[PDB]
RNA sequence: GAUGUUAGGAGGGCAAAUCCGCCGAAUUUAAGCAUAUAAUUAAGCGGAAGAAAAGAAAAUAACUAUGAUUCCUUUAGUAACGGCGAGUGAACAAGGACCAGCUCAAACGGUUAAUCCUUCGUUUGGUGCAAACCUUUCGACGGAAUUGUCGUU
RNA sequence: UAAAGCUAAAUAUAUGUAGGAGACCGAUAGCAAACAAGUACCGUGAGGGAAAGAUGAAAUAGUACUCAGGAAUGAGCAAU
RNA sequence: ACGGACCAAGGAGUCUAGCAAAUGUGCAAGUGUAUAUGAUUCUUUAAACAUUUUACGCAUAAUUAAUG
RNA sequence: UUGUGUUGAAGCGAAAUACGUGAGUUUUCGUGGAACAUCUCCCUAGUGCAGAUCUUGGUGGAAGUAGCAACUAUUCAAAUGAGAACUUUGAAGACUGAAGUGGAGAAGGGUUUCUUGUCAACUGUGAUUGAACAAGAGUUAGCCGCUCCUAAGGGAUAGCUGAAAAGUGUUUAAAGGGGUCCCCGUCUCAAAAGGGAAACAGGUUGAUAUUCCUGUGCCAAUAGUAUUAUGAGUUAGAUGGUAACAUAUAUAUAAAUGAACUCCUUUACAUAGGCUUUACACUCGGGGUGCGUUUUCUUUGCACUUUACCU
RNA sequence: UUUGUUUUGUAGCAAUAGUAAUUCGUAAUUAUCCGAAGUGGUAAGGACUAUCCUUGAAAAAAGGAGGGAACGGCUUUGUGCUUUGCUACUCUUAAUACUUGUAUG
RNA sequence: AGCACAGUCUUAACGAUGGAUGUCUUGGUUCCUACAGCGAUGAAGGCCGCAGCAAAAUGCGAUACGCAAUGAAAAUUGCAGUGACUGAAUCAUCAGAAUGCUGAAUGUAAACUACACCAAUUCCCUGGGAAUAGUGGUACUCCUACAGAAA
């Protein structure tokens, strides 16, 4: 059996949701140079680096995932102290 | 004595036997011997009975999505050769 | 808002690109919804639509351009084969139903069923 | 009636052997050219007790000779032999206590 | 408990999900409703 | 015989009203009950089709004879079975619906397997916008087959 | 003319689907279910299994305004 | 002696097979046209209509285990 | 067949100088707002209720009654609020009494958690409360667990039975690995208390912490080539001690040749009894610091005076 | 290069952290965190003694040993081996570079 | 501004409670007719998802209350929004494309989103240029052909 159809593996549209905006989100962005993103349940540690990595121009630190009751993954994403977390969390909103 | 026949032992009801067997996803899956008392999953077979006509009418086909089934329904009356698609404007 | 016959016109070189661009502007419109921001909500369903749209057009393109490569042969794989019923396709065929021994074949051509009248 | 006690003992659910910390099964050596044709000796190297059983076991040690090697035997004890002592089998065997002779 | 497997998680998050009220503004054109302590989801 | 993630294929499960095999009760009736009846039923297991199954006489008759199967009217609650009690119970002929006959084995063919399949090619024309499809006979290759394919009756 | 085989029709269809009907039932009836019905809910489980239709022609007429009340509401010389 | 706190709605000799009697009707040593067929019938009509001058049931004859 | 209806049908409530003997029939008023009758004759049936501890639904007297009784116990003032015995704050009197309504977990539950609102119903009195209702939010791990191993044992394969369904599980198995021809060898599941690579302290939120932050560590893995550098060893594998045994301290005790084939050890194990050591706990005295009593006495009573993993 | 005598350090972690205090705009400064003991409650360890017609799991995984298969480097003859000419070489940890599919968790 | 005893029972009028009755009916029931298998090309069934605001039901499958195509063809609307002056808004048809995890379920397992082995895989341009830990395959039994081993 061959496949026509281009691929419908899970790219980086798709992987990455959105980010996080409430209280907590925002207030570890400032405090712990931390980024907070909603991904869908498939996404893995090495997904979500690679997605921010080539979604924005950041450089990942470390990840850590949480799976929440509304079926989605929540990833806090440390940034490294390259570049900080609040001129891009400004960029994209 | 306070564990009794009644009240007594219903407050050690904890540690089902049943789960949600994931051929019916309905919980009868029993655990310890690993075989659903509903459509009995590790069999090859759905443990299907004729003395109950409720049990059968409530899983027989018909009562899901059909997914592929109603599709392929009315091509009887169309057919339409596979490939073949209407002429253009 | 993109027709699905302009388009259809398309290598699918840029057919990918506009499939990419408009998924990033997809992903745009939902980190505004998911921020404050309300307001673009309702363009997310004609994005979607593109989207959809574009993604069709890709997948018949390739779709085609397999069969072309697959043209007679013999030998095409399960899915571009035909997809009857089972029984169907196992069904024998109507040259296997129809044929006959060489005795009954020049039974049948010596004797047919004739069409006649009467007074 | 119903079915009585003695009955249901053949249908082995709680009536099997409480054979859990058992050592093994108490054999002598299997039948080899060796045994046929001369002696054999085997150190026994211990002497345990089989919670089953009353007479206690014997942890023999022979050496292969088909393969280098050494094998291991469970043999019943009997009385008055003694762990380091040597055990001669076969038909050659010399009788004394702890061997083991064609009768 | 606290230690769950995955799927019962989701199950989980499904049923809370599917434990909120009809939106107001459909309402102007729920009864498979439950709560924790009443009805046991059993599931 | 093994073994092969060798090449190409098939089976598995669902669904049952009708259909085909198996297995198989008791309630009930007999005013009790044991044979009998319920019933060659229910439950259980397996297997198909748009129908299935049966079907082309090792048939019936006893006549001035009929002529595969199935079904309808009837034979007929009859012949018969049965603590000859309760109960059970066909077939032939007759009138109709429909109507269809056939092939293996065995025989015969050795101045010649005359057969079959796989794979790779060639064209004979056609309906399709396309996708695809229907016809086509010249091969070549590799096999199967004399422990028997094909032709004749 | 047994101990091998094929075979259409007339035949049956409490199933599924699609049509058409009726001296049928008319919401305690008719399918269990006219409705979000094999749903809610019950049982560890096999299974058990409901209740619940009707504003008006038109809510593209679903009660504006005032008074009294914290509010619910009530009242009106006000109102569809 | 048992059932009945009250009210509404529902609530029980029916259907089919087969036999007889009774009565009405048609025809009468005959009666019934079965299955099926035809026919400018095909909303009704799934009913009505029809049946080239030894189909079948019952009756027209009884009796006997029975050849009769 | 021949009639009644928006100039109001059916139904329903009360009735009638009404008819009948009676089931009933027929009329009036009111309500109702869309259908109804046929008694001209006949056809048809799921056709007539007081009961069946009848079925379903609704409603009574009992009755503002029984009752709202374990868990010693509340009081004063204030805030909020329309409203405070049971919301909040302060004061007091008491309770639980480390075998705790104190902290952690498992099973089970599943969002009850948090914040902000909020009171239709519920919270058997009240209620502004709440585990109720509404909107949002909240669960971060290489080191905690699962995941791996095997146990009681389960399923399955080969067979063999059985019409099958199923029953048993090596009963004539030619059944993956290893080195390099031979050796070993059914599979799989079953432990969140058994076995088991490796983490601590301080801090942080409204809600998470051995998970986040800070700092300090530890475990496992790290392919091939080539360079360097670290150490050893050697002109093919080191050395001390009589011995028990010891030695590589490089950032880092990393290297002390070693195949096939073997033999061991650890993992790895009951109970009872006392003796002993250590850590933690408790307690005593001194020093310092703060607080309290202070009519009288009191060199006084109380609190703090700490130090993890790793090396 | 050994033996006796002082100082330092809560042995490093470590005081920078905690705790209890005194002050200062409202985020900072300061001082303390050290001299001795008793009871035996809990837990673990040790060395033992005793009991059994009761002897009180396994495997994954890890380690030790016995044994002694294989043997430098550069160049060359001849069909891995004999050979000629020269000696500075083999292991182990770490880092870097390139190749390897993207070479930590 | 004053007068009735109270309670209990009866009657009438008007109302509360209740949901009978009548009238409705996109439902049922029965009969007649016609067609009739779906699945390793992965079925039925089960989960999980999908809308701007979205719980259920209905619909659908990462192209997710719908894509494309064909016929009709101007609306669609609660708001927001989208539509021509007809491949566009909405219906209908539905042949193309797509069709998540499962399930006979079939790599090993299963109260695990656990663990294998073999090909690395996919895409773009007309031999290059990229991106990917991603993608396929691997059950048991059997048939036909083939392979090299066996006596």
Redesign the pocket.
Known sequence: ???????????KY?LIKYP??????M??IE????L?FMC???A????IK?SV??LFGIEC????????????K?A?V?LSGEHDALEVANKIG | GKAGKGTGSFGK??????????????????????????????????????????????????????????????????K?????????? | ?V????L?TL??????DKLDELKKELSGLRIS?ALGN??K??????V??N???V??????????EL??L???????P?????????????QL???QKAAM????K??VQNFPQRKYLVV | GRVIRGQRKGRGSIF?SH???R?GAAKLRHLDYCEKKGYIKGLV?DI?????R?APLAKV?FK?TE??????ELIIASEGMFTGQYISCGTKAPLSVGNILPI | ??????????????????????????R????????????????
């Open positions: 059996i061959v496949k026509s159809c281009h691929s419908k593996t899970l790219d798709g996080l905006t409430s209280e907590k989100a207030k570890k405090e712990i140079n931390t907070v869908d349940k498939r893995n540690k090495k997904n690679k990595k080539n630190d470390k990840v850590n995932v949480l799976n929440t009751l509304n079926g989605d929540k806090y440390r | 009801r904890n540690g089902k036997t049943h789960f949600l067997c994931l051929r019916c996803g309905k919980r009868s899956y029993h655990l310890q011997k690993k075989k659903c008392a509903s459509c009995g999953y590790p069999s090859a077979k759905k443990r299907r009975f004729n003395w109950s006509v409720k049990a059968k009418r409530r899983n027989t086909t018909g009562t899901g999505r059909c997914r592929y089934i109603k599709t392929l329904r009315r091509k009887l009356k169309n339409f050769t596979e490939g073949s698609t209407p002429k253009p404007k | 808002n027709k699905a016959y302009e259809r290598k699918k070189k840029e057919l990918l919804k309300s307001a909500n309702s363009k997310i369903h004609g979607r639509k989207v959809a749209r993604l069709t057009v890709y997948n018949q393109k390739r779709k085609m069969r072309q697959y043209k007679n042969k013999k030998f095409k399960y899915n571009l084969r035909k997809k009857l019923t089972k029984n169907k396709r196992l065929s109507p040259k021994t060489l005795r009954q020049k039974k | 099997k054979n859990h910390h050592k190297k345990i007790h089989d919670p089953g009353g040690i292969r393969k280098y090697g050494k094998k291991e | 408990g606290s230690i769950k497997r995955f799927r019962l998680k989701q199950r989980l998050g499904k049923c809370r999900r599917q434990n909120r009220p009809v939106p107001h503004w459909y102007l054109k729920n009864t498979k409703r439950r709560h924790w302590r009443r009805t046991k989801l059993g599931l």
